[PDB]
UniProtKB/TrEMBL annotation, chains A, C:
The gene is N. This is Nucleoprotein. GO terms for molecular function: RNA binding. The keyword RNA-binding applies. It holds the Pfam family Tospo_nucleocap.
Amino acid sequence: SKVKLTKENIVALLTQGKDLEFEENQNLVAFNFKTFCLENLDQIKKMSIISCLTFLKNRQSIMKVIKQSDFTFGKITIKKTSDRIGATDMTFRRLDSLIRVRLVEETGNSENLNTIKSKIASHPLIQAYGLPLDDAKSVRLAIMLGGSLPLIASVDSFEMISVVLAIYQDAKYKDLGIDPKKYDTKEALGKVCTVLKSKAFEMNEDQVKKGKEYAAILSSSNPNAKGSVAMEHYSETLNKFYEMFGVKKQAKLAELA
Amino acid sequence: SKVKLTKENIVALLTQGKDLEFEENQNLVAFNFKTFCLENLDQIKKMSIISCLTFLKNRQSIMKVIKQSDFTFGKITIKKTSDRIGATDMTFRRLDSLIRVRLVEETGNSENLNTIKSKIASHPLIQAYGLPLDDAKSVRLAIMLGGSLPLIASVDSFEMISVVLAIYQDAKYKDLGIDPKKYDTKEALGKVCTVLKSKAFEMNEDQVKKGKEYAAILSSSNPNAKGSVAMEHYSETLNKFYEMFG
Amino acid sequence: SKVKLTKENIVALLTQGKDLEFEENQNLVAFNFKTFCLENLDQIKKMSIISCLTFLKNRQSIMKVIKQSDFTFGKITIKKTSDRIGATDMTFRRLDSLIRVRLVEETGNSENLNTIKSKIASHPLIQAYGLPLDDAKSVRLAIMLGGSLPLIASVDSFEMISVVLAIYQDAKYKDLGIDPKKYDTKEALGKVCTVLKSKAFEMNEDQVKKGKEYAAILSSSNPNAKGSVAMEHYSETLNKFYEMFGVKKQAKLAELA
């Protein structure tokens, strides 16, 4: 019946009259971060709450260094080769995701919640989002900004905070200064949903209740992306050029004949 | 004076101090696929209908393997990166186009029409477009999806379906998940027209009438390549959150 | 607690329990083209004046060829981006920007200014903008057309000409045939301002007058994009299908009041 996709079978597909079909799956299972998280979370737990927050704050800078070469810390090594990642392999996104899950777990402790709330108010994403940091749910949202939503969504109880944040990022991508060329905000929401359906997640009344509480906090936020702030800083002089680009007539007072 | 636009001439442009200009290269549609198709179609007709559908379904994977080295099947051989293709040479895109032209033929046969309808309903492109596989014209559009529109447009009676699908791809490119960096959707529409103008194709009332029936099917479709199948499942609840953010 | 952001300290961040924060606070953030330009412009200076204009004139054709494989010229190589590009690395846009920067510098030389002026009047972009090309400032604007404004803006003395052209493109995007869906002109102006704000650039009295002289020339140009000839022949019947797909055709108004 169905055969494996090979150079010889493509030749058979094109030169013979036999019905030929290829086996598309080529796998056993899709990647599951919930599983990866249970097996790898303890390893990052010997980190400091402060250090985890430092990782978050200097994400882009830290990522660059990890990307320079095969990054090894302890028993774990983050390979430079982007292609071929095993379900056991550690990538930057997976490291980033583990740390955020760890940070949210720590928000169940009153002391850690206060350290996290104080420190994360200084993070660039939190200020750009204009995120109000009052209660525990808002602090959790703060930890989530910039994280891989489709990965984190697979961890239990992270479903609603992930999908609601994805919706908000889709709706307000312009105000949040998200470049559509670098981050497909619709595709992200799609991947999160794929993850929820894979673990048979049902959005009952209790889950919707949680989500709205998350959504309210996101609504109460005042997004101020770096780009729009940069124009505000120069608006007084930028406007003087907009005026000059108003209506103008060509070849006025030519006086020809 | 003017020189040929090549990789070697570009490195010279960037590394030397000599004055270099590139010759102008208008689109004169040199290669006529209609001619190429008439000469090569009978040979692709020896393939199984199921086999043709298998080709379409696994386009990107089959391409990578064929591109790895000089691929030979029968008397025909697809050379990798010659950089200059004769009107007689076989390329991957030309083979892909032939197979799609062959499949559209078979939609006049009831037995063939239904197997294609049944088989192609599982193709990734058809689902991303959200195309309703109802009638014969709908099945033809399905076979067309992902094909080289400028090439196929030169084949007789394939004009309207090529340009209407091209316009559609330009209008709904965002919903269709077409990356402008990978596929210039405007340039494609232009090429299809350039091809049509070259064969002195005139869009009388009959051509427009046929064209509209294709356009009708495409409007009734619900494109969502970016979206997941799972998105539609939660959609009723997701939208309750959108309203709070609007 | 506070340390220098290094690879060794990241390993410490991830493997130990000590509190670690990165006090670097460099706030360089996005890649800085000013620094890159100083290191590579000298390399682009041995290139023929005529050749630079040829590069601009055949931009997309050259780009496509550059995109085909790892393109190497001299010591420099433009890799095909499987992932992301480093700060020392050469992209096409960076090459394009260097070449454009080199050309405006040449407008300080009277003979080259005349050579550039004669040749660039035939460029597609210049005719589409309907740019007059009288003096040196107009010729600089011509070279600027099609360039990466956020990249070039970081180079000294290029601020005003970059921001003025961006404002113009945002204002007259309709006349220039720019699809808002493919190129967000508001975002572009924002990125340019962001680059300016990252430096201590202030639009003083001297900078604004310089900017206005650029704006005057842009005001005097009358944009009219030609589009494809084969599409104009089929335009009347083509538009019907466009309107079936939710694309209303713009009303052509005589403005006779």
